[PDB]
Paper text:
E. coli NfsB belongs to an extensive, functionally diverse nitroreductase superfamily, members of which are united by a conserved structural fold and fundamental mechanism of catalysis. NfsB family nitroreductases catalyze the reduction of nitroaromatic compounds, a step that is pivotal in various biochemical processes and exploited for bioremediation and cancer therapies. This catalytic mechanism involves hydride transfer from a reduced cofactor, such as reduced nicotinamide adenine dinucleotide (phosphate) (NAD(P)H), to the nitro group of the substrate, leading to its conversion via a nitroso intermediate into the corresponding hydroxylamine or amine. The reductive half reaction consists of initial hydride transfer from NAD(P)H to a bound flavin mononucleotide (FMN) moiety, and the oxidative half reaction consists of subsequent hydride transfer from the reduced FMN to an electron acceptor substrate (e.g., the nitro group of an aromatic ring).
Author numbering:
A (entry chain A), B (entry chain C): 1 to 217
Amino acid sequence: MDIISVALKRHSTKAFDASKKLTPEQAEQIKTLLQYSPSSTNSQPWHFIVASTEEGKARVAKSAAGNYVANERKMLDASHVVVFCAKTAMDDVWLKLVVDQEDADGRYATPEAKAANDKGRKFFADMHRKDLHDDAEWMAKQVYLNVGNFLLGVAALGLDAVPIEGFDAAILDAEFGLKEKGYTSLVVVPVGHHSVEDFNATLPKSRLPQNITLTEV
Amino acid sequence: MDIISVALKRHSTKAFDASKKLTPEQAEQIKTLLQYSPSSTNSQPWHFIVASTEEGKARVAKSAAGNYVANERKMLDASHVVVFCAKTAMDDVWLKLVVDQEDADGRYATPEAKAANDKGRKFFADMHRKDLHDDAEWMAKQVYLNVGNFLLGVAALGLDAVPIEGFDAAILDAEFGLKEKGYTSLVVVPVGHHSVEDFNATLPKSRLPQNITLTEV
Ligand SMILES: Cc1cc2nc3c(=O)[nH]c(=O)nc-3n(C[C@H](O)[C@H](O)[C@H](O)COP(=O)(O)O)c2cc1C
Ligand SMILES: Cc1cc2nc3c(=O)[nH]c(=O)nc-3n(C[C@H](O)[C@H](O)[C@H](O)COP(=O)(O)O)c2cc1C
């Protein structure tokens, strides 16, 4: 089926079949999607935790215990659980890693082109770090864009998923020592195959009409 | 084209062929993708401007005149230009439109299920607009998730696109009267077909290795 079929038919999975696992092929495919997301200035201001062990999933699921138990079971029963993390600050060392990797990949003909690109990336980075002091929000936005890309990609692979904001980020950060590493957890996405308990697999999709949300000019 | 091939072969178009237009089918398909993006609590806190006339695109392109000239040319040369807008405040009238639509689309068996889901959505909204005072940032994150969905989607339709943060949002908001309508422009995505001047169509994609960005547990 075409990508519009995928967009109309994917859903937020509310219950996962704990017997059904990604193939080793699908495990590699979902990591490719995470890696190859676009981002502003190719800043890639992100870390992914991909929990596939029973222990790893249980460690992520701690973030949902008590106040978010419906979300806790999705993290325990899915095959693979992705934690989307943003960097907590945009530093020149990260931007150097990115330009060096672009240089390794051969995107710069001359040291002058490499310098020009670094200069331009820094201009955008400084609008956030220095002028607006919103660089943490700007990086977080790029991570959400990756989630958007990710949810559509895993649906087109024929996999079930659910994006989760209902979790305790302080608990999840502490569990994986993310603050010390320069990251903060934003979104958790369990990936797998829905079970018969997934009420949402058969509910109609609901969106506002285009005559409310979309202007043509 | 499997979706991993789409993810690995899509690119940020640096120049559009102004003679190559979306087909009528494609023009409807890109609007479906905008509408059916997921969002936290199905909040859909967004407006889209789709500019396809010369006059409409020129009005968008004013936001990039002067200090973003490359971006200006992309907006003038693409077939269709999408302005992604966030709501500036999460109000109870928008939450009522959303739950009334979910009710009209058949997601609720009883008035009780509807009130229950309305109160659940209000708990989340209130965390942002009452506790954290970050509903503007929260809604802007949902719009960036829509953008991530959209860029992979249009690539799967065989269309070229580039996401643009390099514009003046104050000029664009003024040009369409967005502030008074309760919205702000976040990202501009020209859609169409790349030209011969698109140097980025023949460069390999560059991303940080998984051994930096990705921990398996
Ligand atoms: C939020 C966002 C804003 C962007 N803004 C611009 C822009 O103003 N101009 C531009 O030429 N490219 C822009 N890009 C494209 C990025 O530089 C590009 O996504 C990144 O280098 C990765 O390359 P790819 O998209 O070709 O995979 C933007 C990308 C994102 C995700
Ligand atoms: C950013 C984000 C966070 C979400 N958090 C949760 C969550 O904590 N629990 C949950 O069951 N669903 C969650 N969802 C799923 C949304 O309710 C869902 O995307 C929305 O109702 C649209 O329905 P669909 O995803 O089935 O198309 C989240 C979705 C988004 C986009």
